[PDB]
Amino acid sequence: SMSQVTIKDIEVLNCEYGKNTIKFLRLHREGKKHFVKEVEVCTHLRLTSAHEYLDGNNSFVIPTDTIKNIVLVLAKKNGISSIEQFAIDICKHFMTTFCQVAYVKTYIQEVPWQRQYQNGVPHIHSFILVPDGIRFCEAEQCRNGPLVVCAGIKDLKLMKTTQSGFEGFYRNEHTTLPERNDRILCGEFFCKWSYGECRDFDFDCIWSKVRECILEAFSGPPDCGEYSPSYQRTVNCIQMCVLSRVPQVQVIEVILNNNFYNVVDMKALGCTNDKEVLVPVETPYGSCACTLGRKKYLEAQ
Amino acid sequence: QVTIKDIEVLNCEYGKNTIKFLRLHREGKKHFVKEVEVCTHLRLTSAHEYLDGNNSFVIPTDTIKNIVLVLAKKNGISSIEQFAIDICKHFMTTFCQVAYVKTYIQEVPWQRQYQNGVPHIHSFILVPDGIRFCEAEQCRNGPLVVCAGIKDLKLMKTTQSGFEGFYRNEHTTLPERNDRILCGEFFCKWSYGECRDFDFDCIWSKVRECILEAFSGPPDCGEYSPSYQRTVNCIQMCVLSRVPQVQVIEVILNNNFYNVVDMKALGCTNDKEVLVPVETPYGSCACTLGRKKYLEAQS
Amino acid sequence: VTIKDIEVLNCEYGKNTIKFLRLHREGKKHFVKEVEVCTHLRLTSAHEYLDGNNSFVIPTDTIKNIVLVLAKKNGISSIEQFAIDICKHFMTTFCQVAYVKTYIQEVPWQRQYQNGVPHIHSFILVPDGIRFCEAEQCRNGPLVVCAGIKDLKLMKTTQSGFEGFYRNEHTTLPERNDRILCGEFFCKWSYGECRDFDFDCIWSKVRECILEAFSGPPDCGEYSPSYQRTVNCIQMCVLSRVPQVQVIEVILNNNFYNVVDMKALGCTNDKEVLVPVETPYGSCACTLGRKKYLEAQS
Amino acid sequence: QVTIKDIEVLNCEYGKNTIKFLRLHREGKKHFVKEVEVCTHLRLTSAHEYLDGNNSFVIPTDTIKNIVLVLAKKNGISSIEQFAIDICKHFMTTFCQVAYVKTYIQEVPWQRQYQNGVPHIHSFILVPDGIRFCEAEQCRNGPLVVCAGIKDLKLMKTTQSGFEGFYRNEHTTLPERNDRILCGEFFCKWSYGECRDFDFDCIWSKVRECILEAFSGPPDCGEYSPSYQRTVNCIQMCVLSRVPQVQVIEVILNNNFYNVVDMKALGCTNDKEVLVPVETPYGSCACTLGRKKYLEAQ
Ligand SMILES: O=c1[nH]c(=O)c2nn[nH]c2[nH]1
Ligand SMILES: O=c1[nH]c(=O)c2nn[nH]c2[nH]1
Ligand SMILES: O=c1[nH]c(=O)c2nn[nH]c2[nH]1
Ligand SMILES: O=c1[nH]c(=O)c2nn[nH]c2[nH]1
Ligand SMILES: [Br-]
Ligand SMILES: [Br-]
Ligand SMILES: [Cl-]
Ligand SMILES: [Cl-]
Ligand SMILES: [Cl-]
Ligand SMILES: [Cl-]
Ligand SMILES: [Cl-]
Ligand SMILES: [Cl-]
Ligand SMILES: [Cl-]
Ligand SMILES: [Cl-]
Ligand SMILES: [Cl-]
Ligand SMILES: [Cl-]
Ligand SMILES: [Cl-]
């Protein structure tokens, strides 16, 4: 119909920009005892207009360099009591300082530094990297909308060697999977939960409590464990534990990426392999994901 | 144009890489796991597969994988070191066309889960706090040598570290510093030579404790490091002083500088409060120390 | 005054210092375990005290016979397993037993060696700290096992002080940052009901923790600012490195070594000649337990 | 009634007992300890302190202690034998009134601690596996004689022992036995006479090796003992064959019989499995052997 499209022909469905992987360590000294919080911050903005795209005019653009500067200044002046409070302080600063900001999102993850110990005695200033699951949070706010905070844990890899099966599934001409009532259940978990606009609690304490719920629901009691009839059922058991034990959690998303461990057939090698040697299949891999919300929280919107 | 008689075969080696498996063991309802990654390489007495297209002497890399899995099944894995020994011994004593065998093993760092200080019978969590590995090798008619190690071990102290009194030249702009963050990623490897009259797990743990303690110093005051290099030496001398089984120790320290961000132009003072890691480029230092007694004793 | 005015707070009886050697032979090679056993009972009634009625009393002679028969029939893999077997035997054999406690200590026989070769059947007494254990059970309550080391005498010649202590008008002790630290230790630890480990292995591991924490590393040692702090270092080492230990009790009986004033004798004594003071002597004692374990009891 | 005229002084002797001290020596960071118990006794050339109440010639026992401590400080202690020699020589050269001096010394058995085969610079553990002692004595204008020994040495073998073919009378109920536990606590003491041209520590260790090897026999099979008395002879003949410095050797063996408990009345057979030691009463035997040449040469 026409030889080109012009602004009049097209709708801007989304415009977003920001600064990614702002890495720094906040050091706090109480005499000779040293405290560290090392983080990675992503902060993204949507502006009220798109002249920098549509017209080649930068008048309203806050440089991403400025976004980095603000994150480092706020760390210096405010410290970091929790990554959640820091994500909140960043979002509130952008919304209050810059009228051209329609929307702000701050994602933060912690570098998993632990204090070193010598026969139970905490070291004043020495640390070791211990990645047993990465702590993150995310704060976002629309102009004239609520400031919403999420916390989570990712790269969390749990494995139980029994009390796991997958049976009674749908069968068809392309379904060769045998029924199994014993197998290794190996999952890499991404867990993310919403507090909504709630802030009246200790962020670090509540995060720890959720992490506990995830490990406990996954494992079952330490003397006997608990049967899992699917990866999916195990995801629901985790979500329902967190919701049952942590009232501040309004919505919870859990993604389980599984690895199957095959009992190697050793008959041609002159052996019987009685669930002794198991080879992980890393690709392809199965995943399942569910998001559960409290009826009260969702209806209250 | 060029023929077999103009060229010398300096080296021929082949193997199977990244053989991954979990060895499961049950004592009633209590389950135990060892998950490993194994490389095994061979040198053969002839090179006909390369020079002539004749495979008669070649043990398939598929067979190397089958043997590793069969040995894990029949022998179990008490320690990765004993399993590395078992694999090298099997190749040496089974195949007369093997001139040399090398097995590398690394553990997947599964930890048993705890609820209220009670250990879980069959539930585990992945906790990398430094990757345990080992390596066994042997030439025909030569010692079976065992090495153990820890890698991807990232240690950081926020004080008791400087670098001063260095060599000055026209291209040297580095300031002298007596307070900086010391952050290093360590690769540590040590040889037991032929000795195996000790508990591999116990001695591996002891060397690890030596590394952490020599790095950190005492927990109430720490200990001043005047260079990355001096910290490497304190680790090595601590291990050799406390672990006679260690004959030779190699330590590599890959460091990250943490820069106190100049916040002047932002109207801020930064008194060592906000520090930015420089990941690339990065400094390295490496040292191998050996006991004179062990070195001289090799005829 | 009458039985009606009087409460029986406690009644207990038993057989003490039951001494025997259990000999085991694998062809030419002999193995020994020589022990001393005490076994005490509390009965469900006190008719022997209150009425002169012995109908419920198991003779202490029978307690000895039972200890000797079980050693014969069961052998002794570990003193802890033997103590368990004796408590279990009393609880299943005699319903009038309300409570049983068995204490066992090992006679410290070591196999003799000649130029590195172990002797098939010859031993030497080597007391380097006496191994003991204790098992006890109430009727329908848990069987609890403790192991320990006593008469363990350790000494370091430096890396010991006592400074910054409370001063008053009767305090003449000077501040010291260098002294001999000499202690006789009693150490006892509870496994609770946990029994799924090698008793000998774990005992050896706790012993090594005690010596290493007392001494510090062999190339430099470790400063002790008090006997009390050294007790704490030993306990925290054991608890940090041995998960099976739930509760640990350490008693340190110290001996002061005085640098003799030889000025009157025309001599300077630069910490060269030291005289030990055996009485009076100082003691300190601490019991630490895992919070998780102590909560799980209540 | 009776006066000095009617009575003869057969013997007078006095001294200081249990003088305890530690001698500490430092080579850089490395500490060396020798802790000893010293007894020093004198006979004087007169007895006026007893007979007349005149103390003019008495050296206070407090002075004997001061001299032992002063000599430890000034000389150090290379060996307890050299220290005992130095004490006797001091009393003889210093005091006109000394007719006779005897010095007895025993070592406190401190052993350096080891961690994973590494010797600790300054930490020790008490390990009493046979107490080292010595004794020096001298009459005025007579030879200074030195003895060394080992006591409280407890050895046990579980077979290769019997006692048969002994004298029988109407009061003899002991059965012939060809297979018993041989358990002895040994006191061994030997004389070097006046010879001192050797390493005292070296030679003491050699004698101790000889006692353990002769008691035990070879590690692969042992050696049959037909009595305690013949084991004492084997020990002595082994020392005299292998250690030419030893002129005279005394060995005292205090034995403990281990009874195979008769368990027929308890429904059991006891096939040398459970044995009970008899600590009292107890048998002893003692022999002193000397080289003909040294006994003639007196
Ligand atoms: O638990 C399981 N869920 C699934 O959806 C599935 N698909 N293959 N195996 C499976 N196991
Ligand atoms: O400790 C240090 N060693 C070095 O070699 C170096 N080079 N730059 N900074 C350094 N710091
Ligand atoms: O370490 C010590 N603790 C004490 O309680 C004490 N009392 N005197 N000396 C002492 N030394
Ligand atoms: O060896 C022995 N000697 C004795 O003199 C003796 N007397 N009873 N048993 C004995 N055994
Ligand atoms: Br021996
Ligand atoms: Br030791
Ligand atoms: Cl640590
Ligand atoms: Cl497979
Ligand atoms: Cl070839
Ligand atoms: Cl856990
Ligand atoms: Cl700096
Ligand atoms: Cl060396
Ligand atoms: Cl043995
Ligand atoms: Cl002092
Ligand atoms: Cl007289
Ligand atoms: Cl007999
Ligand atoms: Cl001989």
Residue numbers in the entry:
A (entry chain DDD): 0 to 300
B (entry chain CCC): 3 to 301
C (entry chain BBB): 4 to 301
D (entry chain AAA): 3 to 300
From the article:
Here we show that the Gallus gallus gene we name cysteine-rich urate oxidase (CRUOX) encodes a functional protein representing a unique case of cysteine enrichment in the evolution of vertebrate orthologous genes. CRUOX retains the ability to catalyze urate oxidation to hydrogen peroxide and 5-hydroxyisourate (HIU), albeit with a 100-fold reduced efficiency. However, differently from all uricases hitherto characterized, it can also facilitate urate regeneration from HIU, a catalytic property that we propose depends on its enrichment in cysteine residues. X-ray structural analysis highlights differences in the active site compared to known orthologs and suggests a mechanism for cysteine-mediated self-aggregation under H2O2-oxidative conditions.
We crystallized GgUox in complex with its AZA inhibitor in two space groups (P212121 and C2221) and solved its structure at resolution values between 1.7 and 2.1 Å. Of the eighteen cysteine residues of GgUox, C287, positioned directly above Q231, is in closest proximity of the “peroxo hole” whilst C14* and C289 are further away at ∼8.5 Å from C287. The X-ray structure of GgUox suggests a possible mechanism for disulfide-mediated aggregation. However, in both space groups, intermolecular contacts are, at least partly, mediated by the loop containing the sauropsid-specific C98 residue, indicating that this interaction is also favored in solution. Exposure to H2O2 also selectively oxidizes other GgUox cysteine residues. The evolutionary enrichment of the protein sequence in cysteines suggests a disulfide-mediated activity achieved under oxidizing conditions, such as those found in the outermost layer of the epidermis where oxygen exposure is maximal.
